Symmetry: D3
Subunit: 250 residues, 6 copies
Amino acid sequence: SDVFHLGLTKNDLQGAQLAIVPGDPERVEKIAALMDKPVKLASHREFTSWRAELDGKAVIVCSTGIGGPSTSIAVEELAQLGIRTFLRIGTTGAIQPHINVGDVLVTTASVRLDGASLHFAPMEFPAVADFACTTALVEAAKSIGATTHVGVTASSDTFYPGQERYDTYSGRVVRRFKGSMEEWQAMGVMNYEMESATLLTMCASQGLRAGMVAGVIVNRTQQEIPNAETMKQTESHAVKIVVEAARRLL
Amino acid sequence: SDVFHLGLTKNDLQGAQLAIVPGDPERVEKIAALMDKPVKLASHREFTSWRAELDGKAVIVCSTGIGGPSTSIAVEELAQLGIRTFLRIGTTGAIQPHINVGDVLVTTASVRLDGASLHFAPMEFPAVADFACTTALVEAAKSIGATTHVGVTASSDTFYPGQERYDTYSGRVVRRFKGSMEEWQAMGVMNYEMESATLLTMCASQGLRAGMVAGVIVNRTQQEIPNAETMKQTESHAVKIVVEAARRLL
Amino acid sequence: SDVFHLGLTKNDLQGAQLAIVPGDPERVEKIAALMDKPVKLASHREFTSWRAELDGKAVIVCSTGIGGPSTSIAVEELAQLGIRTFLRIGTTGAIQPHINVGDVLVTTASVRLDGASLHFAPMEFPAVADFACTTALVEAAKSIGATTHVGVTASSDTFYPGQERYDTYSGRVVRRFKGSMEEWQAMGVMNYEMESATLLTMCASQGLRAGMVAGVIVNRTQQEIPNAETMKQTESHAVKIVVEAARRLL
Amino acid sequence: SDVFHLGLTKNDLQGAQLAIVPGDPERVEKIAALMDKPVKLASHREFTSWRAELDGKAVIVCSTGIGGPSTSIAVEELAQLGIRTFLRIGTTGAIQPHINVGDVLVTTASVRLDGASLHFAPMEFPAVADFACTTALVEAAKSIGATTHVGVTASSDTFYPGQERYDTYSGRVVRRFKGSMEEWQAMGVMNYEMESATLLTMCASQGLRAGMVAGVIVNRTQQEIPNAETMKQTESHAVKIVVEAARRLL
Amino acid sequence: SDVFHLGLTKNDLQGAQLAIVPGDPERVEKIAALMDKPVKLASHREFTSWRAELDGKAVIVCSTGIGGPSTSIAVEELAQLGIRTFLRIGTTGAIQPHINVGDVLVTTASVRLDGASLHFAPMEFPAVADFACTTALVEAAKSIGATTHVGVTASSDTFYPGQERYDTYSGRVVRRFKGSMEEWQAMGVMNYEMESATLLTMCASQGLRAGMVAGVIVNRTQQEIPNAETMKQTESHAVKIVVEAARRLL
Amino acid sequence: SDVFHLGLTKNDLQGAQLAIVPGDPERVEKIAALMDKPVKLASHREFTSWRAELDGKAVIVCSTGIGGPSTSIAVEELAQLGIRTFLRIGTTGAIQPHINVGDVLVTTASVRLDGASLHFAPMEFPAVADFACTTALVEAAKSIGATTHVGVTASSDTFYPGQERYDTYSGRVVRRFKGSMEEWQAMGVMNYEMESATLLTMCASQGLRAGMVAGVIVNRTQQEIPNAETMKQTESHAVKIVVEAARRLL
Ligand SMILES: O=c1cc[nH]c(=O)[nH]1
Ligand SMILES: O=c1cc[nH]c(=O)[nH]1
Ligand SMILES: O=c1cc[nH]c(=O)[nH]1
Ligand SMILES: O=c1cc[nH]c(=O)[nH]1
Ligand SMILES: O=c1cc[nH]c(=O)[nH]1
């Protein structure tokens, strides 16, 4: 093993330079399935790695887990192995009324409501996505006739208080996040996810290209609930979208 | 007579939805003169405004003066009149060895080294440029075919210390900015300018679309003085890219 | 030229060490007109400089434009040129009930609500004015019988949100400033302006003497925008005392 | 079932109130193995739970995954199901020349080099461990004869930059952390780990009891080359410690 | 003398290594009178020191005056003199409804609402008590017989605004502290005092041991206000515990 | 007796509205000894108070103790009693090479390196002295005759690390203050003291008048700890000036 956590080697990558990176290990194989010669590489803790081919070039699909810390370990060690491009494919809840379930969200930059970001660049620095990656995502989305929304995302270190959830044990929200959802909504923020701020900031400040697409499972402002399924349809659409996007970046 | 500083009315814009905002009041005329039916509207303080037409579409060109404060006033009142799209065209200093004077830099998002951006959104909010605009600006630069670079831009509130300049009256740089240039370089920042952080933030926080393009007049690493035509040929050059970009955003 | 922005040479100042600095370039002439041998020197961007003589000694009048950024430029290059004493003179929105429009406010120190100041000194450093300069302004106002108020001033990097104006396009004010006006008021802050903070800080920390005075054109405890007629000789009181003050500082 | 991520019901916990919380999911069964009637509960994402018994009191063992974000979901949901006391057991790298590999570190409070804890309380708030837990841990540790150290530890949101490691892709570390390790050591901080800050803070500020113990696997000041069975032996001792400590907390 | 403020020489200590540091200089004698052979050493400013014997060992008792600044001097200089362990015995205002007047409160760590702590360690560092000292105080309380509460404490640099008291000259409280007491209560913080943050931080970051205990002379949630009882039984009650605790730290 | 720590009733001030506040309770007397009808009022903690008479006017002399915390208390409570003008007389350490021991220093505004000031105003608020108080102090200095310097002083919450002293127990200074002394020096700061930041901020933001004057007792650019005949005269000097400054503010 060349890296400490991912249990992989330079050779193991077969010369890959691009890595699709979901948060859940269970999703790694499904995605890799959409490409040629999908083989499992390794699996330690929350990082399950898989390799595949796309139009001749080899591509890596590895999980990050939840939060920027785990994410920063995958991105770091993956970069050490030759990875230069990172694409985030996830699921998220919309905080905007007009964004409806089934809509895909490409992120241009993120509100750094995390902590790992700061370990790579001062808060002044923008958690900005790579133009190429972002462009590729929007095009791959447009090509698959999807209802796409491009914009800012709020990347929180917590699933509850940072996303102003009160339905909790304490039932309280720290002063800083009290009333913060109305704020982000007013500023146009599209949704809450938990790893883009760290991914985008660490990459954008290290010469690595990153981008992020994400299917909308739920909506923090609507009342209706996901149809007769939730993840399933959209889930697989955003997945096809990121793979397609990967094609125009190799 | 409506807006307080610009001294303009709804009628003066003539239904204009998009405006080009250079920093220098003298560049306003030159840009409007590149379009159809250029007509001066007003000129107060550092805000001189003109109106023109692109493919039958009324377009505004209003200077902002130097810095985020004056820029925030121009943008606000312009939006009070109906503008929803803003394209900034300015001059800039590159801090990367490969970006020589004369190049065109399109800003995806900016390192917030100002103060006005904080009057619109907390530091954690990304001073990110609207996608459409950025896309239009990149394409336009590729149309006229110019050496172009896309990435982050450090937007300083000062021309000297903020951009780590030691050849000044006092010659000292406050701790926060000492060594900062090598940092921004190490992080791949492309250049220094003085209004993008405020422009991009106030717009992404209020539903306004904004793009940022700039011509390199100096390279903080290289050793040379404005050739002759240098800032002049550069300026008339980027002035074409942005107008050509706006054309795509009308 | 000797400097990059103002387009002046030390010779143009004729040994002048004091400069009266208005924000609006269209007042440089009006103010120089109250002194002897007024001679225009230049006009670049929002930097319009005129030279004159007071008691046989030369004095400079040069605009700074709106906000600390353009101001930091003006002061610096002007200081490189030889000015050691700067007296700002401007318009201002009072936030106290008793302060009437037309009254002159002398600023002892400013509430740093800008960004340029941080480029010269960490926030802990007071945006305090020079004692001699303040004294001269205070006494000049006494020998004129002008309704004078001297105290703390809030220097904002924006004219709208920063000064908590709600009559805007979005109509909202970021958290940092919601309810911020009544807070300053409770603290006895006299007014709102947009350059004293960065001016007083950059001077206080670089061996430069600075003074600040302004004429009240609107009372924020009544309205956000004035309807009041700007220029016969109403707020001229501020100018008269800034000249009379300069006279003493030569 | 009662929570969104863990996939548990209060019934599955059967009255348990104290949970041991390691990072690595594989150590959960191992911890449970040293207790009575242990049984697998559920496994979702990096959240692997097991329930066991001690002195006829039910105990829970749940993994938190790497980092505060992941941990904050486990702790909150564990608390929703009735857990009041949390004991984290983990691996760590000492920064003190006197703290050797294999030694056992008990944490009184952590340096908050994370972001999630802020989502529960402002920085001024101490990421401190409960006194009872800390006592049980120190006590339990003396009983099986380990070489113990009781103090503060640096809880970082990153494994690389935040722990000032330069053997990385970029080879750089933000200004914020350059020379930071030498400053923690100078301050007496014992080690680096990645979850105590969030755990300790969110518990101490919501009426939950929490403590932490760990074993040293690496010394950032030298070369006690990983003697491959070392992590094995060094871990069994802590695990017995955290269990013995838990016994005194039922 | 060997120090600048205390007026003490190493001889004066007679090999002593522990110090009981009350805030009131008049309490110094009262404390020493619970030991053997009390002897007044010196008195300069708010620094009154006495030496006594505790189970045969030399022990120092030195006042620190109110606030972190005075506290920082005493501890630094006492440390220069040879002291290694500090026990803080003070009075406080309980903020939890369940903590009654006369109760004894031991602090594990404090909320840093002071400024001196930052002169020893960044805000992210915890203001935590030494394990041995806190253990000694918990045991002494039990050996003495008292209602004791162990937990976090709010350490404010002021007695009024920083403790959200409103019956003051101004009757107003700065934004930072509005609704802050209600917030700490929600976080389980049990009380307000004015020197633990400094003491705990400066000791934990410099290798010195520190302990914090105080007597509740008032409860901010009840209308009843104790008469002489404040500096009476409650004071004497906490005074006996710290001396008793001290015996275990020799 | 009307206030909580000073042991004074409003009737005790005999209609006094101005108070001189030295940091050392032992000098209160010496100060009163310079006025008419000096009467000892009380002595509680570091708060020793006296009453005197100047030109048929009541004046109070009350020590505040070292630091903003105890200083904020004395001031607050003295204010509740009727005092609206506070003149502080202290001892300081010159940072500039030209300021000699024995020199009198009047403070215009000070660098806020304290914490109490934050309890009255945000950090951008200037710790600025009252104009009338500063004027009289400067005028009184001309009368008494002394080498005077009027400027910015750094008010530190600590005597050693905050003033970057290395003659300490640890011999090291926290990052924030490493090489901080020559930074203030290069910014023209003239001295280090420990109460003005709190005094000036709390008064200026609460509608109270305050001035600052202090006699230099050491020049840091040549030594860390005080010398030879000292305060015997320096103290008498500054006292003579502050007493004369008080005559001017009645
Ligand atoms: O160096 C430079 C050139 C142009 N504009 C800036 O702000 N800086
Ligand atoms: O209200 C006003 C008027 C002038 N300048 C400001 O900054 N505010
Ligand atoms: O050095 C080390 C070892 C384990 N875990 C960490 O966080 N750091
Ligand atoms: O409320 C109170 C009582 C005593 N001491 C404090 O600091 N606060
Ligand atoms: O050096 C010195 C002298 C007096 N007071 C201080 O705060 N520092």
